[PDB]
Swiss-Prot record:
Top-level division of the source organism's lineage: Eukaryota
Protein species of origin: Homo sapiens (Human)
Complex formation: The nucleosome is a histone octamer containing two molecules each of H2A, H2B, H3 and H4 assembled in one H3-H4 heterotetramer and two H2A-H2B heterodimers. The octamer wraps approximately 147 bp of DNA. H2A or its variant H2AZ1 forms a heterodimer with H2B. H2AZ1 interacts with INCENP. Interacts (via M6 cassette) with ANP32E; leading to removal of H2A.Z/H2AZ1 from the nucleosome. Heterodimer H2BC11 and H2AZ1 interacts with VPS72 (via N-terminal domain). The interaction of HZAZ1 and VPS72 is enhanced by VPS72 phosphorylation which is promoted by ZNHIT1. Interacts with PWWP2A.
Job description of the protein: Variant histone H2A which replaces conventional H2A in a subset of nucleosomes. Nucleosomes wrap and compact DNA into chromatin, limiting DNA accessibility to the cellular machineries which require DNA as a template. Histones thereby play a central role in transcription regulation, DNA repair, DNA replication and chromosomal stability. DNA accessibility is regulated via a complex set of post-translational modifications of histones, also called histone code, and nucleosome remodeling. May be involved in the formation of constitutive heterochromatin.
Cystine residue pairs: none
Subcellular location(s) per record: Nucleus; Chromosome
Residues shown, of full length: 16 to 65 of 128
Protein name per its UniProtKB record: Histone H2A.Z
Family statement: Belongs to the histone H2A family.
DNA sequence: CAATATCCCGAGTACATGCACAGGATGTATATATCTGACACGTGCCTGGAGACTAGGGAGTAATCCCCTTGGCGGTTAAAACGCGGGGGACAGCGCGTACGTGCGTTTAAGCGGTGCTAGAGCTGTCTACGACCAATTGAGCGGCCTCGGCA
């Protein structure tokens, strides 16, 4: 049974659709997995203010 | 006080939305990977501190009238409201582009070795530009000479 990384952060937003998005805006180099979990929850958190 | 207007409440009104569904593409999951760069280690520099002194500036004041500020000004239209015109609004279809799929083959990235371009070197080695001073010019205001208009 697969989990989802959204549940391990505790977030409603898609932590793995981000990551794949960031990996397309990246010079020629990679992106840490712990970036998607404070990339998200600093896009959610504008929702629930907007 | 009268009148035009905004506010408010209930009937009646399409479809919008939230949902359930099939299913597909991608997020996950595991194993592997090197290498980014974390971390650790000194190197050596400037950021900072700390003093003595002049001279530039800053702060202060004084005098004052410029400029702002105000009132009162006189003059003409945006607004008000109406009449009044045409124009923005709601349906029928064509086919052309856009998309999308196919197979189109151009070029880049990579790893190769060779080598010359550039960017840190100098006291380079000066000498443009940087003060320093002099000289010219114009303009403005103040005396001074000289015709004429209003008054004895």
């Amino acid at each position: 049974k697969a989990v989802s990384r959204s549940q391990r952060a505790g977030l409603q937003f898609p932590v793995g659709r981000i990551h794949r998005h960031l990996k397309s805006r990246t010079t020629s180099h990679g992106r840490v997995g712990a970036t998607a979990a404070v990339y998200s929850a600093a896009i959610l958190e504008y929702l629930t203010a907007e």
